Symmetry: D2
């Protein structure tokens, strides 16, 4: 179900910090019309860690209802530990999600044994939905063990992984190991990279979950097509262009803001400039970008956007 270009949908906000439902609908259309293959609701690029449980449910329902079956929707169920995650799986089921995306436990100290039990219990709560393990060491401070991942795949517990480690050699070793084990169809491997998607496809990955795909969905859809057609030199040239668009995330001055403010902020500034969302408002405690910063971001978008 979940292969190809699957952006982690952003959550547009109003200045009061509420979900901008009408902007979220327009963003959904932007993604779908840009040729994506699926949507991942309630990921990190969705500000899931910033939204309340009620706000998550509204965003997820908004995305599902507006998508209207055009592409499949998977739901993040990111929370510190199993019981809390399983509450969110209940929420996702109620909303009509077609997949789940969970990380290892976090805040708490964990262990591969406990990570394994965690995934098994989450799958048991919704055994008919494909569960993907989201490998995001920068946020959870554990790396998902590839041997564990493949055992769970064999057991029908995991349908795949979204890998945002930034380690292309590790993702490549995982694809090789999966293929060697005969688990190619059973375990989809999607990169979270925004800048090395060509590489992932060249190694036989199944797709990509790129936050920058909110801004330029058609660029990623075109890149995937070029890779699937074996047009590698062309793919690398388009990826280079994408990588220059990505400079929007480096505009914000991180001497006084987090990489989240600068990066998600850059993406939201780009979206507002293109008239897809009303505002670049971010959840507390994100820092605002300056008028100089936003002007800079606009110019980059005008230069390197693919459409």
């Amino acid at each position: 179900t979940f292969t190809g270009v699957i952006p982690p949908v952003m959550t547009p906000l109003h200045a009061d910090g509420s979900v901008d439902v009408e902007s979220l609908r327009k963003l959904v259309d932007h993604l779908i019309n840009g040729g994506v293959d699926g949507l991942f609701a309630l990921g990190s690029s969705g500000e899931a860690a910033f939204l309340t449980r009620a706000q998550r449910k509204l965003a997820l329902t908004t995305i599902i209802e507006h998508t209207a079956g055009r592409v499949p929707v998977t739901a993040g169920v990111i929370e510190t530990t199993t019981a809390r995650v399983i509450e969110l799986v209940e929420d996702a089921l109620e909303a009509g999600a077609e997949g789940l995306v969970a990380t290892a436990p976090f805040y708490t100290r964990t262990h591969d044994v406990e990570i394994e039990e965690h995934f098994r219990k989450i799958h048991a709560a919704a055994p008919e939905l494909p569960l993907f393990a989201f490998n995001i060491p920068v946020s959870v401070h554990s790396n998902l063990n590839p041997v564990m991942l493949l055992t769970l795949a064999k057991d029908g517990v995991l349908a795949g992984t979204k890998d945002s480690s930034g380690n292309d050699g590790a993702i490549r070793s995982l694809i090789e190991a999966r293929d060697d084990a005969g688990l190619t169809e059973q375990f989809k491997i999607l990169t979270g990279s925004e800048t090395t998607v060509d590489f992932a496809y060249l190694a036989g990955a199944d797709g990509v979950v790129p936050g920058l795909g909110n801004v330029d969905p058609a660029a990623y859809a075109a890149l995937a097509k070029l890779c699937l057609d074996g047009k590698w030199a062309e793919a690398a040239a388009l990826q280079k262009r994408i990588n220059h668009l990505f400079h929007i995330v480096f505009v914000g001055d991180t001497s006084h803001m987090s990489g989240s403010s600068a990066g998600l902020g850059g993406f939201k500034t780009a979206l507002a400039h293109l008239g897809i969302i009303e505002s670049n408002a971010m959840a507390v405690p994100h820092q605002s970008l300056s008028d100089e910063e936003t002007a800079r971001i606009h110019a980059i978008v005008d230069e390197f956007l693919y459409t």
Copy 2:
């Protein structure tokens, strides 16, 4: 006033994973009767990260109502980011908490400027309650900047800090800076250490928040008293005894379980052995301790308890 010995209350559970309210009340009594100065509900040792919001609210109300004004109760509001933390501040207000304990944002990438804003916004949600910043880099993966903390203390936003960095030198430097800045009364510094409480007090800390104090509250109360009396050599001797009881956290085999399972499992095993709580049950996905592991814990408890 949150000074002195202020344990982070555990959450006893039934085998089914539900909050055991009856065992929780007995634990509260055990602590208060052991001479503690306050209680910290919904900390890490309380399994706050494992409890649902609804379970946390049941644990918090259980502790506040059973305490019945005997000592003050501060509430953890541990969540990833500001809006989610403020929901829990509202819950704490509804329950009648007398203080708040919050960490930096986590999951998300953060920055000192955002951490500062976070604490300002939390304090704004409940400005009548003392807000303590909880420095726990092992869990949140940010270290709270001591200059920021003292800036917030001066502004009336923070009442103190609970420091579980495990870095005694850094905690000492913070105390010294606080004192040199004239903020001694405004900003209470409590150590989260279980094994270096005497050192904290020698350096002029205001108290301690020790997980092991759930098992042996009277030992920590006695230790604090020794320090406040200036009986440092006696304090160090008692601390050494405490540090041998603390071996209960090192019994669980961490080749197949997390440190949380061994450490919190050890404390709960001790508690059940002492008859304070019904079961050593732990929230999913913690691993069970074996009957051998539990028997070794019982032996340590029997030898080293105060």
Copy 3:
């Protein structure tokens, strides 16, 4: 001068821990006959951190003398701080090295300012030799700042970098930034990856410094050729084969040995099996591989060697 396939030559040893000069000569021939473009003497795969200064000088002179001008030789000058490095630059000059390879300071706490001064002083000691900065965070615990690297390149202080960070996205951003700055010819970027060389070339890297290229030099030379001819699908297939040969490094049981023992040990076991070196002896305090381990390694080499 230093582009293409440039293996970090190993140092064969005898059981007494002395340099096996006759095996080193045979290894040099193996590399050169396998079609490499250059040799990097006294790198990490050379056990430079284990050899005494006298032993380093012997290995370096042995490699230079035996190479007999067939391909160019660059010399590692790895030491904790500037003055110590500059002693080794004297040694390299005396041996007739054609290039230098230095890391940031280590053991000591450092800073980008001090890293910059360090490279400037090393270059000033041998201004006619191309100096490459070796980015190896796992060993020196600093990451070389790409802005610093390009400023030094502009200033004629650095000729290039050998990047063993394992971060393909970072190396790609560095290549893009170099190209954007107009520094393409002035600053050669070589990957230390053994498993993502195709990716490096697809992004426009200048070559590769692969330890596994000691074992299978012709595989890497063939892979570089395939990439330079634009034969990307073929390159990825050969890289996959190379990546299975690489399993030799995962045989050793790291429950009782370092990754150095298992990995360099695997390479030396492979070399001895192929009859290129006399023994798989490693420097103290490396742990020996077992007879079961060595048998395993032999079987992998027999299956996946390219020649």
Copy 4:
């Protein structure tokens, strides 16, 4: 016997970067006259990582010959791996060192089994000299396993450890384990901390190796004495004073220099200000302190020196 106050001797330099032997002798006198119990030559604070082997041998011989048997001198043999360390053990033997100080292997990836073998081989090169293991994770990026250390102590391979982890709780646990294992006399535990020496002594450490002791050797000698007399509150007061002198390491602006430049530069600046050494020169690539920075260091020295 390497117990007590044992500073890691600095290496004074001329502006040209050569060892200033005359200033080094005066520094040796300063230390010995300040009441230290021993000297540790070619440590980190000695700029060992910046000196060539030939310079290290000149510094070591200078210190041993000038000391003239007044207190014992242990020698650092800091190098990446075993063969290179053993070359330096030979140099130390030639110079007449009375002890050796070695770290885990570095640069290379290592493992506890290899660390163990490393120390065994170093001890085998000079089995008559006490070998101390130097735990400095910030520089070597391995933590020495305490079970390994006590195994080696039992086997006669290690005489002790100099612990600069900055982790007081871990150092305390090591002392407790050592004592419980009956290895108290066989394995001396010295802290590298400059600011938590009182805590180390309270827990029964054997001494201290403080960089700041180059500047103020009498303060550390006085502090050790207070602790050994059981005057803990006095010790903590003196430690606090020391910790204010220690602000000299925080003057250099680390936006454009390493911690080594600020910290070692601060100590050398203090030393030159006191007239003990000719210049505050530092080995390449350390950055210079500004005349403002130096003047602020002088002010701190003037206020807080013992």
